Amino acid sequence: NYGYQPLFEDRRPRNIGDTLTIVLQENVSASKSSSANASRDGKTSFGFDTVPRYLQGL
């Protein structure tokens, strides 16, 4: 003799020892990224090609 069993309810596991099907469908995906940058240029110049006489002292 087994216990009371419902009629219209689905067959769910209810006690220790009942079986149940697992459908393994796992799909995980993670990601990350980053960056950084910096820059600097400089260029100076000056040239007195032909100096007049009254400025030759400087």
């Binding site: 069993q5 419902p6 009629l7 219209f8 309810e9 689905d10 067959r11």
Partner: peptide, 8 residues
Amino acid sequence: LNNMLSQL
């Protein structure tokens, strides 16, 4: 109905 038939 299918649950009941299966139970029977």
